[PDB]
């Protein structure tokens, strides 16, 4: 039962970049590690065993090295198949343990998200449902945040939201939170706002609306 660690959870390089990944155990393991790469399409393939013996089939571009309780996985130049989560595996003390893999995302010149806030529909409202959404899309660093807040800057209870993967196209990303309040509240509170704040221009990108019509 070893403590496996992949420090740099994820990183963003570019085509041709040479990348190195740091794998750490909690005791000497003696070249007893393996490197798997999970494809975003879920699949999971074996690259190298014995910490450096290349698995027949993996592109030479991949190379093994490491020792003691600190080991390393690396590739020479980037080609779009490799941008994946790479997992480190030990086979020493039977409680075989995979360290938390490392995502290998593409690097793209940042950009501000196009934000959109949508009001609640009569269609739903008339049944009690009072859901509100705010589409924050195509922005560069995943790193970002939204602040759902009604007159009185509070991130009220009813915040559901998820972000996509790196659109293998424009390499950007996008998320979307949803405010859920009762019609009683949709009626009560006046305005409703979405506060997106990104590594844009020290700017709190905000969109809002006011209409408590039932």
Partner 1 sequence: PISPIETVPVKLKPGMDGPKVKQWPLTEEKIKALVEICTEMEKEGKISKIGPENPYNTPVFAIKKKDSTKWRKLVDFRELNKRTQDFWEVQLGIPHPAGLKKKKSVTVLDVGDAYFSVPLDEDFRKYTAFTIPSINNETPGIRYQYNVLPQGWKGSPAIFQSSMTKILEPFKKQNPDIVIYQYIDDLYVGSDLEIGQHRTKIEELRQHLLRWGLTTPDKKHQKEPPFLWMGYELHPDKWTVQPIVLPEKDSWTVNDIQKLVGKLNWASQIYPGIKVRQLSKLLRGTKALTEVIPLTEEAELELAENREILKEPVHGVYYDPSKDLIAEIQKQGQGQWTYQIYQEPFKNLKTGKYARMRGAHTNDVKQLTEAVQKITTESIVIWGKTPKFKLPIQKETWETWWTEYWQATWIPEWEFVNTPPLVKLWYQLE
Partner 2 sequence: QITLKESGPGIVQPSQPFRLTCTFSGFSLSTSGIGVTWIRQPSGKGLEWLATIWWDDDNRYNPSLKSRLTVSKDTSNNQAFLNMMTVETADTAIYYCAQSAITSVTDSAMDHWGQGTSVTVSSAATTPPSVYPLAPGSAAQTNSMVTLGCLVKGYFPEPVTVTWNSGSLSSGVHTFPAVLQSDLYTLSSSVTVPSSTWPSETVTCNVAHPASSTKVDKKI
26 binds partner 2 (CB under 8 A): no
**Which residue bears the tokens 């290349």?**
54
169 binds partner 2 (CB under 8 A): no
- Rounded CA-CA distance 90/29 in Å is 8
- Neighbouring-strand partners of residue 24: 5, 70
Selection from partner 2, partner 1, none that 93 binds (CB < 5 to 8 A by kind) is partner 1
135 binds partner 2 (CB under 8 A): yes
- Neighbouring-strand partners of residue 126: none
97 binds partner 2 (CB under 8 A): yes
- Rounded CA-CA distance 87/23 in Å is 9
Selection from partner 1, partner 2, none that 92 binds (CB < 5 to 8 A by kind) is partner 1
User: Tokens for 82?
Assistant: 């490799």
Contacts (Cβ under 8 Å, ≥6 apart) of 45:
36, 37, 38, 39, 58
148 binds partner 2 (CB under 8 A): no
Cβ-based nearer residue to partner 2, 1 or 81:
1
- DSSP per-residue letters across 20-53: EEEEE-SS---S-EEEEEE-TTS-EEEEEETTTE
53 binds partner 2 (CB under 8 A): yes
Footprint of partner 2 (CB under 8 A): 1, 31, 34, 36, 38, 42-46, 49-50, 53, 55, 87, 89, 91, 94-101, 114, 116, 118-119, 121, 123-124, 129, 131, 133, 135, 137, 160-164, 174-176, 178, 180, 209, 211
């Amino acid at each position: 039962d070893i403590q496996m660690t992949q420090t740099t959870s994820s990183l963003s390089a570019s085509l041709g970049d040479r990348v190195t990944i740091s794998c750490s155990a909690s005791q000497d393991i003696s070249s007893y590690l393996n490197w798997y790469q999970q494809k975003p399409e879920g699949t999971v393939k074996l690259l190298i065993y014995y910490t450096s013996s290349l698995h027949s089939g993996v592109p030479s571009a991949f190379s093994g090295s490491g020792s003691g309780t600190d080991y390393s996985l690396t590739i020479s130049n980037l080609e779009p198949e490799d941008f994946a989560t790479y997992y480190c595996q030990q086979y020493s003390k039977f409680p075989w343990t995979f360290g938390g893999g490392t995502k290998l995302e593409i690097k793209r010149a940042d950009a501000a998200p196009t934000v959109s806030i949508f009001p609640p529909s009569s269609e739903q409202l008339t049944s009690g449902g009072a859901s509100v959404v705010c589409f924050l899309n195509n922005f560069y660093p995943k790193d970002i945040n939204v602040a759902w807040a009604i007159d009185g800057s509070a991130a009220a209870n009813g915040v559901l939201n998820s972000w996509t993967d790196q659109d293998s196209k424009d390499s950007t990303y996008s998320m979307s939170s949803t405010l859920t309040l009762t019609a009683d509240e949709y009626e009560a509170a006046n305005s409703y706002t979405c506060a997106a704040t990104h590594k844009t221009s020290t700017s709190p990108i905000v969109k809002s609306f006011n209409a408590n019509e039932c």
